[PDB]
């Protein structure tokens, strides 16, 4: 009675959402972008190599300065590199060797990491004595910490395997907000240029737009046939792309609340590990589980190029705030900068 009427209300509102979206589905992005001149071939070269990690590299994140970058690796270490000089600005050993994510703070003073410890350990680079001291252990998550991004020196969003995200205030060590709703492990998240919104991708093969301010799910996007491993915003902040274990990426617009474009090829059979946009967004850099890192024309959906500089899975990748270079960490124990 009450549950069957509520189930049919759910399944009616769902087709109301499908019709509200199909109404806006007047034209595709491949049609509109047919006319514009193709991007051509993005011939990329390995500029730097960042050696020193003893095992698989699990994560990396550029600093807002475009020069420094953190990287977490299977060897239990979190290294801060100066991409320009190849020297290790820091080699922080972690209390838990099972690190999976890292995030350079926009200020550059703080760095965050986490993993199966279910804790978001925040470290301070500019310490009283100048050492690499642990500022906080943001604990409370009931699953492995899958990803996190600093809002500021004192605020940080983290995703976890409990099917939730959470905003923390580093000072109090307490979950300011908790973003519940996912039905699978949240693999990734990404703060919008406007810090009031962020999207998150999960193993439920769907993405969700969250409001940092309030803490409610505003929109939910689907289309992927497998787990979503990585997600990030379009430079402007009105769209975001998701990579999935179905060997496909997809673009979603928030204002249109539906999929715009699919990036896949019959040759491409392995899943996507990571994604990133260029400063303008014309280029989408997708990491794969075949040692490759394909460059797509975000508008044409054509595979413009390929970055093949790694012997093992291209686990992680990033782009500088100025888009001047592309970093790609991999399981071969080496990161590689590209231009």
């Amino acid at each position: 009675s009450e549950l069957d009427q509520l189930r049919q209300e759910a399944e009616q509102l769902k087709n109301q959402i499908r019709d509200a979206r199909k109404a806006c589905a007047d034209a595709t992005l491949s049609q509109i972008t047919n006319n514009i001149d193709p991007v051509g071939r993005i011939q990329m070269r390995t500029r730097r190599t960042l050696r020193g990690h003893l095992a698989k590299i699990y994560a990396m994140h550029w600093g807002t300065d475009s020069r420094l970058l953190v990287s977490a690796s299977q060897d239990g270490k979190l290294i801060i590199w100066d991409s320009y000089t190849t020297n290790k600005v820091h080699a922080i050993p972690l209390r838990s060797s099972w690190v999976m994510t890292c995030a350079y703070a926009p200020s550059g003073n703080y760095v965050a990491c986490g993993g199966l410890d279910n804790i978001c350990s925040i470290y301070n680079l500019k310490t009283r004595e100048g050492n690499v001291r642990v500022s906080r252990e943001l604990a409370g998550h009931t699953g492995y910490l899958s990803c996190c991004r600093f809002l500021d020196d004192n605020q940080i969003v983290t995703s976890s395997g409990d099917t939730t995200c959470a905003l923390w205030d580093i000072e109090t060590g307490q979950q300011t907000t908790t973003f519940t709703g996912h039905t699978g492990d949240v693999m990734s998240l990404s703060l919008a240029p406007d810090t009031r919104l962020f999207v998150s991708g999960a193993c439920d093969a769907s993405a969700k737009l969250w409001d940092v301010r309030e803490g409610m799910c505003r929109q939910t996007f689907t289309g992927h046939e497998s787990d979503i491993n990585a997600i990030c915003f379009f430079p402007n902040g009105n769209a975001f792309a998701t990579g999935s274990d179905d060997a496909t990426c997809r673009l979603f617009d928030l204002r249109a609340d539906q999929e715009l474009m699919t990036y896949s090829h019959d040759n491409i059979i392995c899943g996507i590990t990571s994604v990133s946009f260029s400063k303008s967004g014309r280029l989408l850099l997708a990491g794969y589980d075949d040692f490759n890192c394909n460059v797509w024309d975000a508008l044409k959906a054509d595979r413009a190029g390929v970055l093949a500089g790694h012997d093992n899975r291209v686990s992680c990748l990033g782009v500088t705030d100025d888009g001047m270079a592309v970093a790609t960490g991999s399981w071969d124990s080496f990161l590689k900068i590209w231009n």
């Binding site: 009450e2 549950l3 109301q16 929109q219 009105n238 539906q258 260029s278 014309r282």
Partner: protein, 64 residues
């Protein structure tokens, strides 16, 4: 075991009401907007258009 299924099914329907209560925009305009954004910021993207080697920090200088 209804108090859980109902409390869950209510969140679902209260969530689906949230998502459906948004003024969406035509996909055509979403694309036009994104295309004209890239068109606007295409010059300031060194990945799209190769910049001179002098401006590249990773190929022309070792001192920084």
């Amino acid at each position: 075991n209804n108090t859980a299924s109902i409390a869950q099914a209510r969140k679902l329907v209260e969530q689906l009401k949230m998502e459906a209560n948004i003024d969406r925009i035509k996909v055509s305009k979403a694309a036009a907007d994104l295309m004209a954004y890239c068109e606007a910021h295409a010059k300031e993207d060194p990945l799209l258009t190769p910049v001179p080697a002098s401006e590249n920090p990773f190929r022309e200088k070792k001192f920084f």
